[PDB]
């Protein structure tokens, strides 16, 4: 799902990335790493994103 990639970038657009996570998050934002359902759900929990945020389509 390319939507998870775009939503991840959107979330951090007005923030800064934690150094410990900067590497792993950047692989997801650039398409290098796989971006599955469970990973998206865990990422939302880690940062407190609204449930399902990464799978929400754009208008």
């Amino acid at each position, epitope marked *: 799902k390319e939507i998870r990639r775009l939503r991840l970038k959107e979330w951090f657009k007005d923030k800064t990335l934690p150094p410990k996570e900067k590497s792993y998050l950047s692989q997801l934002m650039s398409g290098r790493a796989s971006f599955g359902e469970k990973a998206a759900r865990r990422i939302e*929990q880690t940062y407190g*994103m609204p449930e399902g945020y990464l799978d929400a389509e754009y208008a």
Partner: nanobody, 111 residues
Framework: QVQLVESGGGLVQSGGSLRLSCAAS????????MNWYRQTPEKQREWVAL???????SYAASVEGRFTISRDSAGTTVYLQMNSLKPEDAGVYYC?????WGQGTQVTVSS
């Protein structure tokens, strides 16, 4: 549904210190990350800091080194330690998680 209570704001002199707190229902902060925002005169909802579910942190460029975000020993209350306060730091500070937002706490910095 999640309810959030910010506290600890007030009126402090420039160069002074202030520790904000955020309580959140159901011990959610123990397993969930959160963000601090502030609304200032110059444009609303500026991001300030985050702490993740595991305690890793990130700060806005203008508060790096002066601000420290952390959890209490229990893991259920989040603190924003704000040191060396500047006039640009005044505003209403909001804590948020999971799309829920507290009512906010006011910070005013006098010279």
């Amino acid at each position: 549904q999640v309810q959030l209570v910010e506290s600890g704001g007030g009126l402090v002199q420039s160069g002074g210190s202030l520790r904000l707190s955020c309580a959140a229902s159901g011990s959610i902060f123990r397993t969930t990350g959160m963000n601090w925002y502030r609304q200032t005169p110059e444009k609303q909802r500026e991001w300030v800091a985050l702490i993740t579910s595991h305690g890793t942190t990130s700060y806005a460029a203008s508060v790096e080194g002066r601000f420290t975000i952390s959890r209490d020993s229990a893991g259920t209350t989040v603190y924003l330690q704000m040191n060396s306060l500047k006039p640009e730091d005044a505003g209403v500070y909001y804590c948020t998680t999971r799309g829920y937002w507290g009512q906010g706490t006011q910070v005013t910095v006098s010279s």
